[PDB]
Design a protein around this ligand. Sequence first.
Ligand SMILES: CCCCCCCC/C=C\CCCCCCCC(=O)O[C@H](COC(=O)CCCCCCCCCCCCCCC)COP(=O)(O)OC[C@@H](O)CO
Ligand SMILES: CCCCCCCC/C=C\CCCCCCCC(=O)O[C@H](COC(=O)CCCCCCCCCCCCCCC)COP(=O)(O)OC[C@@H](O)CO
Ligand SMILES: Cc1cc(NC(=O)Nc2ccc(N(C)C)cc2)c2cc(F)cc(F)c2n1
Ligand SMILES: Cc1cc(NC(=O)Nc2ccc(N(C)C)cc2)c2cc(F)cc(F)c2n1
Ligand SMILES: CCCCCCCCS[C@@H]1O[C@H](CO)[C@@H](O)[C@H](O)[C@H]1O
Ligand SMILES: CCCCCCCCS[C@@H]1O[C@H](CO)[C@@H](O)[C@H](O)[C@H]1O
Ligand SMILES: CCCCCCCCS[C@@H]1O[C@H](CO)[C@@H](O)[C@H](O)[C@H]1O
Ligand SMILES: CCCCCCCCS[C@@H]1O[C@H](CO)[C@@H](O)[C@H](O)[C@H]1O
Ligand SMILES: CCCCCCCCS[C@@H]1O[C@H](CO)[C@@H](O)[C@H](O)[C@H]1O
Length: 304
Amino acid sequence: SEDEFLRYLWRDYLYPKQYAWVLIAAYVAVFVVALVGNTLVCLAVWRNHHMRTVTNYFLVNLSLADVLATAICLPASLLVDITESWLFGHALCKVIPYLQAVSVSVAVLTLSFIALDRWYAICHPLLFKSTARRALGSILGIWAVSLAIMVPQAAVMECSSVAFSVCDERWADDLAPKIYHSCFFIVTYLAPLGLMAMAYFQIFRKLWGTTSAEVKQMRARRKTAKMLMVVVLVFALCYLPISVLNVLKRVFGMFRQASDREAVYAAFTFSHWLVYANSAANPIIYNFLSGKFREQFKAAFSWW
Ligand SMILES: CCCCCCCC/C=C\CCCCCCCC(=O)O[C@H](COC(=O)CCCCCCCCCCCCCCC)COP(=O)(O)OC[C@@H](O)CO
Ligand SMILES: CCCCCCCC/C=C\CCCCCCCC(=O)O[C@H](COC(=O)CCCCCCCCCCCCCCC)COP(=O)(O)OC[C@@H](O)CO
Ligand SMILES: Cc1cc(NC(=O)Nc2ccc(N(C)C)cc2)c2cc(F)cc(F)c2n1
Ligand SMILES: Cc1cc(NC(=O)Nc2ccc(N(C)C)cc2)c2cc(F)cc(F)c2n1
Ligand SMILES: CCCCCCCCS[C@@H]1O[C@H](CO)[C@@H](O)[C@H](O)[C@H]1O
Ligand SMILES: CCCCCCCCS[C@@H]1O[C@H](CO)[C@@H](O)[C@H](O)[C@H]1O
Ligand SMILES: CCCCCCCCS[C@@H]1O[C@H](CO)[C@@H](O)[C@H](O)[C@H]1O
Ligand SMILES: CCCCCCCCS[C@@H]1O[C@H](CO)[C@@H](O)[C@H](O)[C@H]1O
Ligand SMILES: CCCCCCCCS[C@@H]1O[C@H](CO)[C@@H](O)[C@H](O)[C@H]1O
């Protein structure tokens, strides 16, 4: 009676309201910070002439994928998690996921090149000379590949006619989605991250009668090595949920029992927010583990 009302008030109104608020709150925070974050990350590079290494041009490219995700995809990501209907029509059903898929590729690819350029620069020197000119050439290819291989993704997207629309992959047969999503979890999460991890372990064992300038070089390479591993670990953790969730859905046909549909909606919703949290996370990573970015942020915060 008197206390059963108080409980029944909670799940039909109090919980649904407190849940929806937290959803829009975390999304607006990530949207703003990730937007303000990566924007300042570019100005620290366009302004501070000393901070233009091969790694920073790649990290600037990492912001470019994050913004495409945040500005275009992220607003679309919020409305679907709230209503779970597609409201941007047949065509944005293909564009938004494609940009989002392309931004993942450009991201995970850029991180591998920063690992690869550093693995040669620190572990196998003057094998390849990596100048900013070759660093920028690499950055253009990432988009050429990301824009291509996410194309088959765009083809599978179809907006479902069945009084509200839904956007989802249209697979002609059971086996293709298993192979497609098995291949791309390997290609764009596990294979890059596992390789990049083995790369950075080789760097840690190295860095952790040489000239005073050389140890000055080691002191800078550790501050960058320390910072970059944080960026990769943050990336794997952020993308671990949605990446595993997608394989369970598409390869193992999981999340098809309707009993805890809220728990499944909830599960995926946090997984989607974690992706954009990585975009807002990275600029914060630079401010703490990079003393030159940190001064660029304080200098930018005072003028604006
Ligand atoms: C070291 C890292 C490794 C990678 C390194 C980079 C390698 C880069 C390679 C190539 C770049 C070019 C790729 C571009 C391929 C684009 C292919 C594509 O869009 O396929 C569509 C159909 O796909 C579809 O529905 C089907 C798409 C899904 C796949 C179907 C089969 C399942 C298995 C698939 C195989 C496993 C793939 C996994 C990759 C990770 C085409 O039809 P569409 O709509 O135009 O209508 C017909 C009409 O328009 C044709 O004129
Ligand atoms: C995908 C592969 C699978 C990933 C997931 C892996 C899952 C697990 C399976 C096997 C891994 C273990 C095998 C090795 C076991 C032996 C120990 C180990 O960790 O391997 C290190 C070597 O590899 C290493 O540094 C690794 C080399 C790092 C290379 C970094 C590449 C940059 C990343 C960009 C890639 C883009 C690709 C595109 C994909 C779309 C050893 O060093 P260490 O000093 O003891 O001896 C140096 C000595 O070899 C000198 O003669
Ligand atoms: C409906 C739907 C789906 C998504 N799928 C994903 O992100 N898949 C995804 C991401 C990475 C990988 N790897 C293999 C690394 C595989 C699959 C969404 C992602 C978002 F960020 C936001 C949304 F609103 C989403 N909505
Ligand atoms: C339906 C759908 C999908 C999305 N994304 C994705 O499928 N990504 C994605 C998918 C596959 C891969 N592989 C590497 C295989 C990578 C990324 C969406 C993203 C959004 F931001 C908003 C939406 F409404 C979305 N809807
Ligand atoms: C953005 C927020 C979106 C909605 C999230 C709802 C999560 C579960 S609360 C929901 O409240 C309803 C009120 O009637 C009840 O019928 C259901 O049994 C109960 O599960
Ligand atoms: C026509 C199809 C699109 C191709 C455009 C990009 C061509 C490659 S530039 C090349 O990229 C490498 C990536 O590893 C770097 O290592 C090099 O320094 C850089 O010179
Ligand atoms: C005139 C020819 C027009 C062809 C239009 C193709 C549109 C996408 S076909 C694509 O084919 C895959 C088979 O590989 C299936 O798995 C996918 O579900 C399906 O979307
Ligand atoms: C006939 C369909 C229903 C039975 C179960 C099929 C399971 C397919 S798993 C799929 O097998 C491919 C084989 O090549 C690999 O390429 C992929 O990596 C892997 O994920
Ligand atoms: C504790 C178990 C939780 C669920 C995991 C089993 C999913 C059964 S479907 C089946 O699963 C195979 C692997 O088991 C895949 O190889 C096939 O492609 C897929 O069709």
